[PDB]
Structures are given as C-alpha cells and as structure tokens.
Amino acid sequence: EVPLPQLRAYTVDASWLQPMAPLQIADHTWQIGTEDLTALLVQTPDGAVLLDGGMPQMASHLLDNMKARGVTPRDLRLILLSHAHADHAGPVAELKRRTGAKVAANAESAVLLARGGSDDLHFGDGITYPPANADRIVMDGEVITVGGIVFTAHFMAGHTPGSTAWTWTDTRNGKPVRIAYADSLSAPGYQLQGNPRYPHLIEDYRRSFATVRALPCDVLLTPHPGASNWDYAAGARAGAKALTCKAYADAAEQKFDGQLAKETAG
Numbered sequence: 001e002v003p004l005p006q007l008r009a010y011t012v013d014a015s016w017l018q019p020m021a022p023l024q025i026a027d028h029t030w031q032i033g034t035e036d037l038t039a040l041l042v043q044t045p046d047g048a049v050l051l052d053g054g055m056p057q058m059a060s061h062l063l064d065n066m067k068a069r070g071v072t073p074r075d076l077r078l079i080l081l082s083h084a085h086a087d088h089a090g091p092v093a094e095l096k097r098r099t100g101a102k103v104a105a106n107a108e109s110a111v112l113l114a115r116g117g118s119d120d121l122h123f124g125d126g127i128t129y130p131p132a133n134a135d136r137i138v139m140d141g142e143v144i145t146v147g148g149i150v151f152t153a154h155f156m157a158g159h160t161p162g163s164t165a166w167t168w169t170d171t172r173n174g175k176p177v178r179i180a181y182a183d184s185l186s187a188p189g190y191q192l193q194g195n196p197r198y199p200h201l202i203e204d205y206r207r208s209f210a211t212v213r214a215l216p217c218d219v220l221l222t223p224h225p226g227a228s229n230w231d232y233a234a235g236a237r238a239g240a241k242a243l244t245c246k247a248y249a250d251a252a253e254q255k256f257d258g259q260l261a262k263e264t265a266g
C-alpha cells in the first residue's frame with residue numbers, strides 16, 4: 001500500500017543560492033542578490049528601493065548586503081518586482097516584516113503575490129512562497145519617485161500576466177545611464193497554444209517582445225542574469241558581455257518561435 005507523495009520543495013541550482021558581495025552597476029545601483037539571481041538596490045538620499053529579492057531564503061543575505069551599503073532596515077522604502085514567482089519575490093513577505101518597505105506592483109502581480117504564487121497559470125502549486133500584500137497598485141507607464149530617482153513601469157505580460165520592466169536613469173562618470181530591468185521572456189514548460197487559463201498568451205508575448213525592444217536601455221539587466229549575458233561572478237567585467245534590450249527581445253522571440261513549433265509537433 002502506497003502513501004501519497006511527500007511535498008516537493010522548490011529546489012534550484014546552487015548558483016542561484018550562492019551569496020555575493022554588492023556589485024555596483026552605476027552610481028546608485030547595486031546588484032545585492034546571489035551569483036545567479038538579481039536583486040537590485042537603488043540608494044537615494046531619501047531611502048532605498050529594492051527591485052526583486054530572489055528566493056525565500058535570501059532575506060537575511062539581502063539585509064546583510066544592505067547593511068554593508070549603509071542602508072538599515074528602516075531606510076528601505078520600496079520594493080518593486082519583475083514578476084511574482086518564488087525565485088524573484090520569494091522573500092518579500094519577510095522583508096516587509098523586517099523593514100520599512102512597502103510594495104508597489106500591478107494588479108496581476110499583486111494578486112499572484114497575495115496567493116504566494118499558488119494556483120499559478122502554468123506551475124499550479126509547484127512553486128510557492130510566503131504571501132505578501134501590495135501597498136500600491138501601479139498602471140502601465142506609471143512612475144514612482146524615491147529620493148529624486150524616477151522609476152517607470154512597462155507592462156510586458158507573458159512569463160506571468162503581471163510581468164513588468166522597470167526603467168530609471170542613474171549616472172556613471174558624470175553621464176546618464178538609462179537602466180532597463182526587463183523581466184523574463186521565457187515560457188518554461190508552458191502550454192503556449194490554446195491554453196484555457198491564458199487564451200491570448202501568444203499575442204501578449206509578441207507585444208512584450210516589442211515593448212522590450214523599444215525600452216530606454218543603455219544597460220539591460222534581467223532577473224536571471226544569464227538571460228542578458230551578465231556574469232555577476234566576473235567582477236569588473238560582470239556586465240561587459242551584456243545584451244542590448246533589442247538583442248534580448250530578439251533572442252527571446254526566436255526561442256519562443258522554436259518552442260511554438262516544437263509544441264505543435266509535440
């Protein structure tokens with residue numbers, strides 16, 4: 001006689017959980033997550049912004065890195081998200097409890113975050129995390145300002161309904177640097193065609209390829225750094241091989257077209 005299976009934890013490649021010291025991207029922007037998951041700290045005179053936190057177990061590491069940057073828990077003002085999957089929004093509930101931070105997200109991302117990633121359109125309950133509430137709902141193109149840095153939301157639905165690119169202008173060498181943190185454009189294991197839970201999935205992805213292509217984008221970063229050819233473990237040449245937003249979108253579209261053809265054949 002055979003029991004039901006044990007719950008299966010969401011396990012990931014070791015590099016996704018490998019701590020790294022803060023890596024500066026521009027004057028006010030740092031990568032503070034792990035070697036293979038992005039978490040961006042943007043430091044302003046009036047407090048800090050975090051874009052993504054990575055996995056649930058990364059919360060204390062993020063706070064240690066924030067401390068090393070001179071940002072105390074009370075100084076963290078705002079959390080923004082690429083998308084509300086466990087490997088990017090994982091520690092958000094805990095960060096809210098341990099810091100001053102409030103969350104701003106679009107309605108789709110807010111709804112998914114509030115169910116801790118459960119009943120995912122594609123993953124079901126396979127990949128979940130502690131639920132958190134959004135404090136502010138943003139609309140497409142809406143801006144949020146913290147200590148004079150202005151962040152713009154660009155909706156790029158597909159990977160999740162609420163997938164979002166965030167853009168802001170930092171400086172490097174007295175010159176402006178237009179940073180584009182573009183969300184994932186993957187569809188890992190997704191049913192793309194005739195998906196009853198996401199009927200216009202293909203059209204949304206196609207629109208999202210165009211959105212990403214057109215972002216203001218001197219430097220592209222992505223939640224999975226490898227998608228944009230970043231190597232956080234490579235120090236001074238971490239960003240050297242980084243893709244443009246144009247090249248990222250193109251590569252994603254080509255991958256997506258191949259996946260569509262494979263699905264039709266499958």
Ligand SMILES: [Zn+2]
Binds near residue numbers: 027028
């Ligand atoms: Zn400044």
Ligand SMILES: [Zn+2]
Binds near residue numbers: 085184
């Ligand atoms: Zn995801």
Ligand SMILES: [Zn+2]
Binds near residue numbers: 087088223
């Ligand atoms: Zn991911």
